[PDB]
Design a protein around this ligand. Structure first.
Ligand SMILES: OC[C@H]1O[C@H](O[C@H]2[C@H](O)[C@@H](O)[C@@H](O)O[C@@H]2CO)[C@H](O)[C@@H](O)[C@@H]1O
Length: 458
């Protein structure tokens, strides 16, 4: 369980965890309470997996979009700031952490993607996405390339999908309509078609991930990348002469990045809730706390009015906000986790040529709207299904091909095997998903029964 009388903190590894650790050191200096900051892999999934059991960190950091799901699952303590403290942060940041009438986290900072460009390679950044292929051709002659960014996380491709009309869930009458999804409309298709064409014409490579794109930009090999405030620290170290600016337009319309509010929630199973509150309100969310984190990795536009004003002159922060204003705040509904995984699979499949754009998005759309049991509880099943071989043999023939069977089996741990199986099946139709559910239920009926029950408990 969770050790009492101390703080364990989880934050993503792309954030200023060293800076946060300093705030932890100051807290220890003034209170005697030791603070431990960790940045585990696959944090957005690890948390609900271990927290559902009743363990995990006292405090979890992520963008606000995942917190609605955490709250619905009972993993988060209710946050009760007094009025004077609440007034120290922007109202729209509190709005991002409000779920079903209550505050479920502390907002820290507002993030949005921008175009980052090498001024020595590219004195004026391109206005449009459409002119990048011509740009890449010029640069290739100098042994360079126009653009590299993470193509493994749909967050980075989202601004282009949304530009001409794609959207996640429709918002109307103060509610998100969970049945109105805009992943396979004409606009989403046009944007992703443009991305795929960049890859087909070798302006980009489908295998490019975060580390690969960062290395290429920071070594001066590519003229542009797409990234958030957290990335500026490494670019500074590399002393690249860079600018941060508005994303290119597509079909004459702005790219629309999703806006995230980095937020901190308190584990509902934590016996250290009061301590967590003190650390967050009186140590982190102060000019001195935020500055320490921000000097490690930039936070963007912080939620704290006083420090936001001090930093607002930074043209890079201005550029972040300009992009944010063209985009949309992410929904925090519990459906977000399944939505992101479906879209992630669609972008990866279309980029790798495993599916056409139309088929990739049509499948994502169907699965986000229909929310099958195996998609809703994918994360729990990955962590809790243990008889993988039994499931594979039930599916072999009917649902799984010989090759897919072999691919799943080849993974090293049970969760890696399960994760592969759900990835492969992600684009399958309802009937195949039903076959997958049936095999899981025959193999582990108590687990499946437990999942049905807890859904109803919450
Ligand atoms: O790609 C899907 C992913 O997008 C967002 O995650 C961002 C995150 O908000 C940023 O702070 C930064 O860490 O990069 C991530 C993308 O790799 C969503 O917040 C997240 O839930 C979602 O899975």
């Amino acid at each position: 369980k969770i050790e009492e009388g101390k703080l364990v903190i989880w934050i993503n590894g792309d954030k200023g965890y060293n800076g946060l650790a300093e705030v932890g050191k100051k807290f220890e200096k003034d209170t005697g309470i030791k603070v431990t900051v960790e940045h585990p892999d696959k944090l957005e999934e690890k948390f609900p997996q271990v927290a559902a059991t009743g363990d995990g960190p006292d405090i979890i950091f992520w963008a606000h979009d995942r917190f609605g799901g955490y709250a619905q699952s009972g993993l988060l303590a209710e946050i009760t700031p007094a009025a004077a403290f609440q007034d120290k942060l922007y109202p729209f940041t509190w709005d991002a952490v409000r779920y079903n009438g209550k505050l479920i986290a502390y907002p820290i900072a507002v993030e949005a993607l921008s175009l980052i460009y090498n001024k020595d390679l590219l004195p004026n950044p391109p206005k449009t996405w459409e002119e990048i292929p011509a740009l890449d051709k010029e640069l290739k002659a100098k042994g360079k390339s126009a653009l590299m960014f993470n193509l493994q996380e749909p967050y980075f491709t989202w601004p282009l999908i949304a530009a001409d009309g794609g959207y996640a869930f429709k918002y109307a009458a103060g509610k998100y309509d969970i049945k109105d999804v805009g992943v396979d409309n004409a606009g989403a298709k046009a944007g992703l078609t443009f991305l795929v064409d960049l890859i087909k014409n070798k302006h980009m490579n489908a295998d490019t991930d975060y580390s690969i794109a960062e290395a290429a930009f920071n070594k001066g090999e590519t003229a542009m990348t797409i990234n958030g405030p957290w990335a500026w620290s490494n670019i500074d170290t590399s002393a690249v002469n860079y600018g941060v600016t508005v994303l290119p337009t597509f079909k004459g319309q702005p790219s629309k990045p999703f806006v995230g509010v980095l937020s901190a929630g308190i584990n509902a199973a934590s016996p250290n809730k009061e301590l967590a509150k003190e650390f967050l309100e009186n140590y982190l969310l102060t000019d001195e706390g935020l500055e320490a984190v921000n000097k490690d990795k930039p936070l963007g536009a912080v939620a704290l009015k006083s420090y936001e004003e001090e930093l607002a002159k930074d043209p890079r922060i201005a550029a972040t906000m300009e992009n944010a204003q063209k985009g949309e705040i992410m929904p925090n509904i519990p459906q977000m986790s399944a939505f992101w995984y479906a879209v992630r699979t669609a972008v990866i499949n279309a980029a790798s040529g495993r599916q056409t754009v139309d088929a990739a998005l049509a499948a994502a759309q169907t699965n986000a709207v229909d929310l099958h049991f195996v998609d809703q509880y994918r994360e729990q099943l990955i962590a809790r299904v243990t008889s993988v071989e039994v499931v594979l043999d039930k599916l072999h023939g009917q649902v799984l091909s010989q090759e897919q069977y072999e691919r799943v089996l080849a993974e090293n741990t049970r969760p890696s095997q399960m994760r592969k199986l759900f990835s492969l099946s992600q684009s399958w139709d309802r009937k195949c998903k039903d076959g997958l559910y049936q095999a899981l239920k025959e193999t582990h009926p108590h687990l499946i029964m437990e999942l049905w029950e807890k859904a109803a408990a919450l």
